[PDB]
Design an enzyme around this catalytic site. Structure first.
Site, PDB file in Angstrom:
ATOM      1  N   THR A  77       2.861  -6.066   2.732  1.00  0.00           N
ATOM      2  CA  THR A  77       3.387  -4.996   3.583  1.00  0.00           C
ATOM      3  C   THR A  77       2.372  -3.887   3.880  1.00  0.00           C
ATOM      4  O   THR A  77       2.729  -2.828   4.406  1.00  0.00           O
ATOM      5  CB  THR A  77       4.671  -4.403   2.962  1.00  0.00           C
ATOM      6  OG1 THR A  77       4.380  -3.885   1.651  1.00  0.00           O
ATOM      7  CG2 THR A  77       5.745  -5.499   2.720  1.00  0.00           C
ATOM      8  N   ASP A 110       6.842   1.058   1.556  1.00  0.00           N
ATOM      9  CA  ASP A 110       6.426   0.071   0.552  1.00  0.00           C
ATOM     10  C   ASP A 110       7.175   0.325  -0.744  1.00  0.00           C
ATOM     11  O   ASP A 110       7.656  -0.605  -1.386  1.00  0.00           O
ATOM     12  CB  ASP A 110       4.934   0.155   0.209  1.00  0.00           C
ATOM     13  CG  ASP A 110       4.040  -0.060   1.390  1.00  0.00           C
ATOM     14  OD1 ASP A 110       3.800   0.923   2.139  1.00  0.00           O
ATOM     15  OD2 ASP A 110       3.505  -1.172   1.638  1.00  0.00           O
ATOM     16  N   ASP A 130       0.824  -1.211   0.000  1.00  0.00           N
ATOM     17  CA  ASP A 130       0.000   0.000   0.000  1.00  0.00           C
ATOM     18  C   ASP A 130       0.864   1.270   0.000  1.00  0.00           C
ATOM     19  O   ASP A 130       0.856   2.032   0.968  1.00  0.00           O
ATOM     20  CB  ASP A 130      -0.971  -0.041   1.195  1.00  0.00           C
ATOM     21  CG  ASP A 130      -0.259  -0.016   2.556  1.00  0.00           C
ATOM     22  OD1 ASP A 130       0.910  -0.451   2.660  1.00  0.00           O
ATOM     23  OD2 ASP A 130      -0.802   0.453   3.583  1.00  0.00           O
ATOM     24  N   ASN A 181      -2.424   2.731   3.928  1.00  0.00           N
ATOM     25  CA  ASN A 181      -1.707   4.013   3.925  1.00  0.00           C
ATOM     26  C   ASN A 181      -2.501   5.096   3.223  1.00  0.00           C
ATOM     27  O   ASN A 181      -2.555   6.237   3.692  1.00  0.00           O
ATOM     28  CB  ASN A 181      -0.361   3.893   3.218  1.00  0.00           C
ATOM     29  CG  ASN A 181       0.774   3.613   4.167  1.00  0.00           C
ATOM     30  OD1 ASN A 181       0.797   4.122   5.288  1.00  0.00           O
ATOM     31  ND2 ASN A 181       1.728   2.798   3.725  1.00  0.00           N
ATOM     32  N   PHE A 235      -0.333  -0.441  12.973  1.00  0.00           N
ATOM     33  CA  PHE A 235      -1.251   0.054  11.943  1.00  0.00           C
ATOM     34  C   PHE A 235      -1.820  -0.993  10.987  1.00  0.00           C
ATOM     35  O   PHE A 235      -3.049  -1.116  10.867  1.00  0.00           O
ATOM     36  CB  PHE A 235      -0.558   1.157  11.138  1.00  0.00           C
ATOM     37  CG  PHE A 235      -1.385   1.694  10.005  1.00  0.00           C
ATOM     38  CD1 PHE A 235      -2.469   2.530  10.253  1.00  0.00           C
ATOM     39  CD2 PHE A 235      -1.053   1.377   8.688  1.00  0.00           C
ATOM     40  CE1 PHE A 235      -3.235   3.045   9.199  1.00  0.00           C
ATOM     41  CE2 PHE A 235      -1.813   1.891   7.622  1.00  0.00           C
ATOM     42  CZ  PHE A 235      -2.899   2.724   7.884  1.00  0.00           C
ATOM     43  N   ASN A 236      -0.954  -1.760  10.320  1.00  0.00           N
ATOM     44  CA  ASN A 236      -1.429  -2.711   9.311  1.00  0.00           C
ATOM     45  C   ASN A 236      -2.404  -3.745   9.837  1.00  0.00           C
ATOM     46  O   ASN A 236      -3.393  -4.065   9.172  1.00  0.00           O
ATOM     47  CB  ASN A 236      -0.260  -3.430   8.655  1.00  0.00           C
ATOM     48  CG  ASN A 236       0.528  -2.534   7.719  1.00  0.00           C
ATOM     49  OD1 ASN A 236       0.062  -1.475   7.297  1.00  0.00           O
ATOM     50  ND2 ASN A 236       1.732  -2.962   7.392  1.00  0.00           N
ATOM     51  N   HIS A 238      10.163   0.281   7.749  1.00  0.00           N
ATOM     52  CA  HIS A 238       9.482  -0.984   8.038  1.00  0.00           C
ATOM     53  C   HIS A 238       9.461  -2.005   6.896  1.00  0.00           C
ATOM     54  O   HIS A 238      10.033  -3.091   6.999  1.00  0.00           O
ATOM     55  CB  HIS A 238       8.024  -0.763   8.467  1.00  0.00           C
ATOM     56  CG  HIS A 238       7.806   0.341   9.453  1.00  0.00           C
ATOM     57  ND1 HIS A 238       7.841   0.136  10.817  1.00  0.00           N
ATOM     58  CD2 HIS A 238       7.476   1.641   9.274  1.00  0.00           C
ATOM     59  CE1 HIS A 238       7.569   1.272  11.436  1.00  0.00           C
ATOM     60  NE2 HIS A 238       7.344   2.200  10.522  1.00  0.00           N
ATOM     61  N   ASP A 239       8.773  -1.669   5.807  1.00  0.00           N
ATOM     62  CA  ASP A 239       8.461  -2.672   4.779  1.00  0.00           C
ATOM     63  C   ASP A 239       9.657  -3.346   4.105  1.00  0.00           C
ATOM     64  O   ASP A 239       9.582  -4.539   3.860  1.00  0.00           O
ATOM     65  CB  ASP A 239       7.490  -2.106   3.748  1.00  0.00           C
ATOM     66  CG  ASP A 239       6.180  -1.685   4.373  1.00  0.00           C
ATOM     67  OD1 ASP A 239       5.919  -2.045   5.537  1.00  0.00           O
ATOM     68  OD2 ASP A 239       5.354  -0.989   3.778  1.00  0.00           O
TER      69      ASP A 239
HETATM   70  O1  LIG Z   1       3.032   0.527  10.837  1.00  0.00           O
HETATM   71  C1  LIG Z   1       3.970   0.276   9.790  1.00  0.00           C
HETATM   72  C2  LIG Z   1       3.224   0.311   8.457  1.00  0.00           C
HETATM   73  O2  LIG Z   1       2.567   1.579   8.363  1.00  0.00           O
HETATM   74  C3  LIG Z   1       2.729   2.146   7.064  1.00  0.00           C
HETATM   75  O3  LIG Z   1       2.782   3.566   7.095  1.00  0.00           O
HETATM   76  C4  LIG Z   1       4.011   1.545   6.521  1.00  0.00           C
HETATM   77  O4  LIG Z   1       3.918   1.429   5.105  1.00  0.00           O
HETATM   78  C5  LIG Z   1       4.161   0.209   7.251  1.00  0.00           C
HETATM   79  O5  LIG Z   1       3.776  -0.902   6.435  1.00  0.00           O
HETATM   80 CA   LIG Z   2       2.985  -0.521   3.981  1.00  0.00          CA
END
Ligand SMILES: OC[C@H]1O[C@@H](O)[C@H](O)[C@@H]1O
Ligand SMILES: [Ca+2]
Ligand SMILES: OC[C@H]1O[C@@H](O)[C@H](O)[C@@H]1O
Ligand SMILES: OC[C@H]1O[C@@H](O)[C@H](O)[C@@H]1O
Ligand SMILES: OC[C@H]1O[C@@H](O)[C@H](O)[C@@H]1O
Ligand SMILES: [Ca+2]
Ligand SMILES: [Ca+2]
Ligand SMILES: [Ca+2]
Lengths: 302, 302, 302, 302
Positions: D120, D16, D11, D40, D161-162, D231-232
């Site tokens: 991701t 990403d 996303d 996102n 979040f995800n 992160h991703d």
């Molecule tokens: O919380 C981390 C996730 O939030 C998103 O903002 C990033 O793309 C990541 O996958």
């Molecule tokens: Ca992401």
């Protein structure tokens, strides 16, 4: 970035198999699918041979589909496996559950850019694609064939084998309005592999260069050849290094009705007709350059 | 239970349109799809005409797809809408987002029983299906065509229109090994609609019987006909009531090479060749019975 | 013209099977496909049961596909064949080589008009369709379910079986924004088949009315019922004759988190929440009228 | 031979997008398709962002499809383009005319070997694939996610979040029986890009390393971070060099019902439950090694 997208349609066939080897050793090309035509052998055998070659080359990721079981309007004539000589692996993967035309169409639809079709057996699948998918013509960059002869044939006095097997399909290709590039016997009979060249390939030393040498060995064991013509790899070689070839644009018609001339490619070399050119016809090759290209590319499998 | 599954391929065309009307008034038949060939008109027009007819008949549930844009190996020749005369509705639905061959193939794959193909324009789509889908031949019960003539042609001296437009496609059909049934000019020139018959259809009194009458009106407004031959509905009529027809099994070959005979259906009526029969050829019809059938079926739209 | 297009998703199941019988006896409906959910029995058994019923009814033309093998987020619980009682034929045809969702999606895509979905087992397939195909929501006219209860459940104190098996899927359906019509236990427990009604069906005298009677026999052999509730046919009956039912539009939420209430359909009958109605809830039926409808329709198989 | 086949679902989203860059610079991986999830940004924006990134990277040959428009059972919440900072090209190609799940399914079907899924963003598409295609589970090698936290969340006190965006989808993934590998906040908060690292990427000197630096710039401009967590790309980095990470196999459950804990990944680190492990949880990373990997791979675009 992304490489040149190609669809390979073939009937292995020792030289078809070597064409696969050359294409897969060439990062400039992205082989999207390989489909099988019937010609050199029955459709079950050419399909099996594509699968065995992709198994050998560890490219089971390339989708494979079997094509038409016979010519459009004629019974199949064939050239006992079709790839005799080397011990080859049994396939480790299955063909797609669709036809060759379906796989070609899917590729063309999915593609973001025009795709180059390379067809080194009879033109049966290619013709079926052209006629059944007029909406996809704009997705075909060109069709590069091995077939035909401006000069004498190798199957009947006037006809080369691939065109003779399916003259109607070849005529459909030449009439299609898509750029056609022809590696006919005029060029392929010059693309001879001498015994010394096979020795050179063997001396490269890897399992694939060895298999290529074995394929060349077996075929060799009136024409006035020093070495065996290696036909089908001329199509891939032309895509990789067109500077190795001399090519002219002329009108080409395929004879489908003649008493003595069925399957002849009639090339208007001297502009005797009013016909606008529809094909690029390969007429010469730097033979040593062609051998050098194959030897260099075989190092890919080290 | 379930009806007889059919695929209808056609190029409307006033008689093609009447064939659609007759088929859709016949619960014995389950029309699985209608596809358009190019012949009577350009492929855009025949497709539009199928859609308009299905709109009129409130059968927007039958999937429609446009087929090949030209003959296999020849330029298109055509017979200004292709259905002139009646005011017809604009289509209220869209064709499927696939080709005719794709829609036919999908139907054959999905089917639990062999499907009857009825093709009343040039055989282009049918031939493409046969050649591109050898694995689906066992799903084709028979192919019922309107085309050809044992006797004189209606387009050139030796050839009927549908075969003449694409002789190669017709030859592929006849060579296919699938049972072929032929409504040629021998039967269709006997299937004449007299002015009194059109009056009878008009007197049935519903919007569809009226449109059929209008279609017949316009076409009518050396052959020695009392009324206009109604060709394409003979295929559907034969499926519904074969007892209305006299039919013989003979060998039929389609001429594709002749100087003066391209598109001729050569019928070995007197067993002069060694060739095994490959077709059922309709040679006679009970004309009043045929008219009675159409009039009876038109009551469906009351 | 064309009938009302429906997709039937079910888990036969004796009443599911009777629902199939009723739908196929009703020319007002065009059953486009039947897919199987898992609930009453394992997915292999419900699929086999759809096939056996279509074989019996000589409707092998209706495409069939097996659906999800378990609930979205829960293990499968089931209600030895799932259609015990009558001797049924082995299937004479194969399911499509795709999933239920794939077959539903294909139907919706192909359709020229919005399609009615009828789902009489757990809502698993329907939910997967809704979530995976947001672009096809406009092609869904409504979703008619058998499931839930405004009152007491038949599986746990608060929950009816179909919703309990997959509460998350049911909640997805109710939250989808597509009109939902619910035949819950409030109506189905009133739709009782008495012994005298089964006798009446048996007296109709044809092989299908006999099988229906046998299915009803076996199931029958604290609730305070005179006869056995015939749940799933209420969905089809409502489509055919809504005047047989009393239905109200209210907000319905499916409980997915409760300690004691998982799978409950919470119906805001008295407008106690601020929630806008999202479902038509069947609350009454003319039982004799419902029996009359089934008996009348069973004459179709004479 | 052939590389490791992967399906990337994401996303974009700056990290990403950097994950895409890293994957496409890695010949060990064969990215078969990229699909977009909503999280996102809105689904229109994440789809557009995948297309823009593939346009930039000259990989228009990788098929792209847009996925689910919202979570399974929840309204969409989002993190103005979603890739703000750098000037990016407009797409030069179109997404495939299918959904994300359809494209994933097609890939799995076509594949001759099990495919690795990397997801991701929210797990919505992956869950829909798992539930709708039980027959394709054997074609999924593993699912590598960025999401969750053994420790504190970054969106709500207990949730990352995800997972929070679609807890039900994440739970479906963890319950699926397919090996799951989790790059949660425990590892990603350690995978910090310092200002000096962005300087280093910028000093690599090519247009792509520049864009990556710009993406990192903009995001950076209570947590106690020295640099921004990336992160991703930890998912792709783990596939390329697992030796950079410390990972443990434990049981993980996703909370979907709690008052205060929806979206939490509950990790049984100390074996307090009887539950068999279902996931590989990344708990440490060699940060400099991770930065070194990104810098080395960015040279691909020289
Ligand atoms: O919380 C981390 C996730 O939030 C998103 O903002 C990033 O793309 C990541 O996958
Ligand atoms: Ca992401
Ligand atoms: O005539 C040349 C052709 O015949 C076949 O034997 C070769 O594969 C080549 O394509
Ligand atoms: O020659 C008869 C054919 O010509 C067309 O005009 C008719 O539709 C028919 O199929
Ligand atoms: O609870 C009613 C449901 O349970 C099943 O046994 C029936 O088929 C019906 O759909
Ligand atoms: Ca060849
Ligand atoms: Ca016609
Ligand atoms: Ca049921």
């Amino acid at each position: 970035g992304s490489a040149l997208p190609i669809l390979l349609d073939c009937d292995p066939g020792h030289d078809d198999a070597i064409a696969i080897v050359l294409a897969l050793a060439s990062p400039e090309l992205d082989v999207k699918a390989i489909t099988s035509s019937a010609g050199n052998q029955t459709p079950e055998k050419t399909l099996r041979n594509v699968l065995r070659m992709l198994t050998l080359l560890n490219r089971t990721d390339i989708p494979v589909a079997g094509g038409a079981v016979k010519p459009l309007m004629r019974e199949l004539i064939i050239a006992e496996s079709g790839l005799d000589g080397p011990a080859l692996p049994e396939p480790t993967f299955a063909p797609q559950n669709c036809t060759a035309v379906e796989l070609m169409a899917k590729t063309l639809r999915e593609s973001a850019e025009p795709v180059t079709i390379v067809s080194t057996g009879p033109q049966t699948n290619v013709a079926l694609l052209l006629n059944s998918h007029p909406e996809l013509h704009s997705k075909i960059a060109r069709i590069v064939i091995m077939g035909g002869a401006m000069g004498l044939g190798n199957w009947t006095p006037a006809a080369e084998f691939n065109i003779y097997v399916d003259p109607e399909a070849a005529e459909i290709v030449f009439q299609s309005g898509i750029p056609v590039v022809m590696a006919g016997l005029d060029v392929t009979h010059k693309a001879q592999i001498h015994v010394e060249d096979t020795e050179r390939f063997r001396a490269i030393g890897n399992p694939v260069s060895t298999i290529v040498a074995e394929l060349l060995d077996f075929f060799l064991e009136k024409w006035g050849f020093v070495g065996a013509p290696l036909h089908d790899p001329c199509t891939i070689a032309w895509l990789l290094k067109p500077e190795l070839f001399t090519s002219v644009e002329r009108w080409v018609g395929v004879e489908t009705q003649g008493k003595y001339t069925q399957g002849m490619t009639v090339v208007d070399y001297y502009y005797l007709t009013g016909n606008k050119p529809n094909a690029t016809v390969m007429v010469d090759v730097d033979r040593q350059g062609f051998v050098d290209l194959l030897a260099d590319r075989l190092k890919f499998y080290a």
